[PDB]
Structure formats: structure tokens, C-alpha cells
């Protein structure tokens, strides 16, 4: 809520400094100081870029008001700046600096190196920074200065490519990750990439919906994994976590709901954000093949990390140290007050989930409903993406089925695939056969025999 570029820069520096303090909360250890200094260096680079962009804007127009800049930039779009030996386009250079700072603070590919190291902070701080507070600064900048980037050739080429590459990279790394906080960090990177791609598509409503969904459910999942880690005695790796469903009953179900919502899965509140992203994806890009392939891979990657985190944390064989289970399994502890977590924590998580559902539903009604009731966005660029959401054609309707069935096959793989010998190998194969045949017959009856 900044009224001018000076206040925006002040807020930028303040968030950088406070994130540095949160990361360096463990001031006694110098190992944490290294990650804090890494984040500080990246934040200072972003501050440099933002300051230079603001200086260019002030030199061009003798004004720092955001509204005035937004409503004046089109007049100066035709101008160029004479630099050392190249006549660079003014809009292109300003948007270049803005996009550089936005990528640095959103942890895009290349500039994301600090985000995995920023997990040294306590789980509440990590959730706050990674949900909607620190990693969404670039998205806020793009949304606020959209009239500038609408006339930016550099933005058009860079936002989709970098967004898709970051999405794919983060999704796959999160899927292969073994630590809870690191997995959430890489999932956040992937969602930031998806947000960049959505903004490139150019539907600010879709971008806002994606931001809200991601922030709410990422925060909820972060809180759940924080409870799990506190129970497991600061061991964030789930290779030492097993059979925690009974010891943390609330955490298990809360994580189930939060993860199914966060990772885009069918019949979940988080499916529509990815559906709208793919609806709005543009196809005139020269690197469209790579962009689309990376987007598909990143979208499918959610299932693997969600399944791994949930199953390994709670329902996998007991892998943790004997003490973790024994200290809590003592009969003396059996009481009405017995719990491995906090009642306040449970109530806070429940209320957060309920309010997130309500707000997401309100936004969906405001935007995606037949009667468009959202407030003015102060942008004159219309992308035509809503045409494929209101009156989709057979081509797109069948195209979406490809991704739907890819996700279905991946779910079947993560469910029925056996990696270790078990007493239930043959019965599991039999259950898979039963499911296949029953699905076929059920489809036959539903479609034809009724």
C-alpha cells in the first residue's frame, strides 16, 4: 500500500531488512549468518535495480506518483535513452530493471539460490516470507506497474520463459526433495514461476486468484510441517519420520487438506488456478515448445511432492528414533489433555483454512462468475483469455484432457507402484486389476447402459 515510488522503495528495503533479521534470528550461530548474508546480498542487488529504475522514471517524468506514472508512461513509450554506446528503448530499460528486481525478490531461476538457504528461519517466519510476504514482491510490482510492462518487448519475451523454467525446476526439485521445509521452498519457487507465467498471459484476475490460493495453502502446509518438525525434535527430514498419523492426528488431516488444495489436483480448490493459467497461456512465443513443456512438467510435479510429503511424514513405516515414539507412548500420559501439539495451534490452523476457503470462494464468484463484478483494474489491455473460459471449443476441451489423464496416470503410479517387497504385493496387483476392470465397467454403465 505505497502511494509513490519513494514509499515503495522504503517498503522494499524494510522487507529486505526484516527478512534478514528473521533469517538471522539464531544470531549466536554463524552458519545462519551466512544464509542471512546471502539473502541480504540478493536484496541489496534488487534494491540497486529498483533505485536505478526509479531514478530513470524521475529523470524522464518529473514526478514520482504511481498513478501519474501509470497514466503518463504511454506518452513517453516512444522515447529512447542514450547510454554508453547503445540507444536503448526507455520502456525496455525501465522494465528490464523492474523485472530483474522482481525476479530477485521472487526467487526465479538463477536468483532463487537464497530461498533454499532462507529456511534456517523458524517455521512461522518461513511461512510468512514464503506464502505471500517476501516472495510475492515481484508479483506486486508487476501488477502495480502493469501499464509499463504491457508496452515492454523485454517483458513479453522474458516473463513466460523464465516463469515456465522456474516452474519446472522448482516442481521437479520439490518432488525429488527429502526435507519438508526445502520441499515447501521449492514448491513456492514453482508457484512463483506459475504466477509469472500467468501475468505473462495477462489476466490480472487469474494472477490474483493464483496468488491467494498459493499463499493461503502454502501457509497452512508450512504450519503443519512446523508442528511435525517440533514433534520430531527439529529433524526436518522425513526419512526419520514414520507413523506420525496417530501421534499428530490433527496434523495428518490438516496436511491432507492443505496439500490437496495447494498441489493442483482434480476436484480441489487449487485445480482452477492451473486450469485458468493453461487457458490464458499465449502461443505466439518463439520458445513456446520449451515454455509449454516446462509448464506441463511443473504442473504434474505437484502430485509427486504432495504424495511423498504426506505419506512419508505420517503413514510410512516408523523410521524415526525409538525415543520419539516411546517418550509419547507412555501410559501415564493418557489423559483428556493429551496432545503432541497445541490446542491454539490447531484452532489457528482450522480458522485459517476456513477463512482461506471463504475468501477464495468470494474471489471466484467475483471473477469467474457469469456476472463480472470485480472492481476496475485500471488497465486497458484485454487479452481475450476469458473467451476460452466462457465458450471453450472442442479442441481446447479435449486438449485439457491430456493433462488431466497425465495427472491420473501419475496418481496411479504413486499409489500402486511397489518399491519394496511386502506381504501385500500379489494382493496389490490384484487390487489394481480389480480397479481397472471396475472403472471400465462403471464407465460403460454410466455412459451407455445407465
Amino acid at each position: 500500500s505505497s502511494g509513490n515510488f519513494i514509499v515503495l522503495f522504503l517498503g522494499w528495503e524494510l522487507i529486505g531488512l526484516t527478512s534478514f533479521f528473521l533469517i538471522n534470528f539464531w544470531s549466536t550461530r554463524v552458519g545462519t549468518l551466512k544464509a542471512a548474508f546471502k539473502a541480504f546480498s540478493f536484496n541489496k542487488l534488487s534494491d540497486l535495480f529498483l533505485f536505478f529504475a526509479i531514478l530513470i522514471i524521475f529523470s524522464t517524468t518529473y514526478n514520482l506518483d504511481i498513478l501519474s506514472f501509470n497514466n503518463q508512461i504511454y506518452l513517453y513509450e516512444s522515447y529512447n535513452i542514450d547510454m554508453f554506446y547503445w540507444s536503448i528503448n526507455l520502456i525496455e530499460i525501465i522494465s528490464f530493471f523492474f523485472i530483474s528486481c522482481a525476479f530477485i525478490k521472487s526467487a526465479q531461476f538463477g536468483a532463487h539460490i537464497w530461498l533454499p538457504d532462507s529456511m534456517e528461519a523458524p517455521v512461522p517466519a518461513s511461512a510468512l516470507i514464503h506464502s505471500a510476504t517476501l516472495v510475492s514482491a515481484g508479483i506486486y510490482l508487476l501488477l502495480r506497474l502493469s501499464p509499463l510492462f504491457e508496452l515492454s518487448k523485454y517483458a513479453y519475451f522474458i516473463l513466460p520463459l523464465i516463469g515456465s523454467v522456474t516452474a519446472f525446476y522448482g516442481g521437479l526439485v520439490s518432488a525429488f526433495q527429502s526435507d519438508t521445509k526445502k520441499t515447501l521452498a521449492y514448491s513456492t519457487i514453482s508457484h512463483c514461476g506459475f504466477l509469472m507465467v500467468s501475468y505473462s498471459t495477462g489476466v490480472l484476475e487469474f494472477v490474483i486468484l493464483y496468488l491467494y490460493v498459493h499463499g493461503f495453502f502454502k501457509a497452512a502446509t508450512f504450519l503443519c510441517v512446523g508442528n511435525v518438525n517440533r514433534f520430531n525434535r527439529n529433524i526436518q527430514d522425513f526419512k526419520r519420520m514414520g507413523g506420525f498419523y496417530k501421534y499428530l492426528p490433527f496434523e495428518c488431516l490438516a496436511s491432507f487438506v492443505c496439500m490437496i488444495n495447494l498441489s493442483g489436483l482434480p476436484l480441489t480448490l487449487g485445480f482452477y488456478i492451473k486450469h485458468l493459467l493453461f487457458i490464458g497461456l499465449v502461443e505466439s512465443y518463439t520458445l513456446y515448445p520449451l515454455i509449454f513443456s516446462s509448464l506441463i512438467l511443473g504442473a504434474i510435479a505437484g502430485v509427486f511432492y504432495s504424495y511423498r510429503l504426506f505419506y512419508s511424514i505420517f503413514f510410512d513405516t516408523k523410521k524415526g528414533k525409538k525415543a520419539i515414539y516411546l517418550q509419547a507412548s507412555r501410559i501415564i500420559l493418557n489423559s483428556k489433555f493429551y496432545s503432541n501439539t497445541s490446542l491454539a495451534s490447531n484452532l489457528s490452523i482450522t480458522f485459517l483454512v476456513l477463512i482461506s476457503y471463504t475468501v477464495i470462494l468470494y474471489l471466484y464468484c467475483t471473477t469467474l462468475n457469469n456476472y463480472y463484478s470485480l472492481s476496475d483494474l485500471k488497465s486497458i489491455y484485454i487479452n481475450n483469455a476469458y473467451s476460452y473460459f466462457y465458450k471453450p471449443d472442442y479442441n481446447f476441451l479435449n486438449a485439457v484432457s491430456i493433462l488431466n489423464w497425465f495427472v491420473i496416470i501419475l496418481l496411479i503410479s504413486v499409489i500402486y507402484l511397489n518399491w519394496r517387497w511386502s506381504y501385500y504385493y500379489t494382493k496389490s496387483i490384484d487390487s489394481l486389476s480389480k480397479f481397472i476392470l471396475f472403472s471400465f465397467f462403471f464407465f460403460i454403465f454410466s455412459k451407455y447402459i445407465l
Binding site: 507413523g243 496417530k246 495428518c252 503413514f315 513405516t317 516408523k318 523410521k319
Partner: protein, 73 residues
């Protein structure tokens, strides 16, 4: 006729299995207690949640269900 075959290799595998030490089994027995672990389908019961879902859907059908338009495609 002095040829190594199914019986010989079964005996070899039995010998290899017998060569194992029971110390690791004894220390790790506690991990696989059936009283302490179950499966996700068992833990996640949809019996009563589906009942509440049915109640809510019935309420929707009899409150706003009337004011809906059929969409044939």
C-alpha cells in the same frame, strides 16, 4: 549326476539366510508393531463425512436446486 540345480541353490539360499544375525531383528522389532501403525485408507474414514455431505447436498437441492438451468452439451 553331480549338477548344481534347484535343490542345491535352494540349500545355498537357506544357508545364506541362516547366516544372518538376529541382533538386528531383535533391536528393530519395535518398528513394525501392528498396534502402532495402520494405512491411510483405514485412518481416513469417509462414513460420517459423507453423511454430512449428503445432508448439505440435500439442503442445497431443496433450497437453491429449484433455481438452476439445465446446460446440455
Amino acid at each position: 549326476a553331480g549338477r548344481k540345480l534347484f535343490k542345491h541353490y535352494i540349500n545355498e539360499n537357506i544357508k545364506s539366510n541362516n547366516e544372518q544375525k538376529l541382533f538386528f531383528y531383535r533391536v528393530n522389532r519395535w518398528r513394525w508393531n501392528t498396534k502402532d501403525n495402520t494405512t491411510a485408507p483405514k485412518f481416513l474414514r469417509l462414513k460420517y463425512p459423507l453423511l454430512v455431505t449428503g445432508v448439505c447436498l440435500f439442503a442445497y437441492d431443496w433450497t437453491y436446486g429449484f433455481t438452476q438451468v439445465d446446460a446440455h452439451h
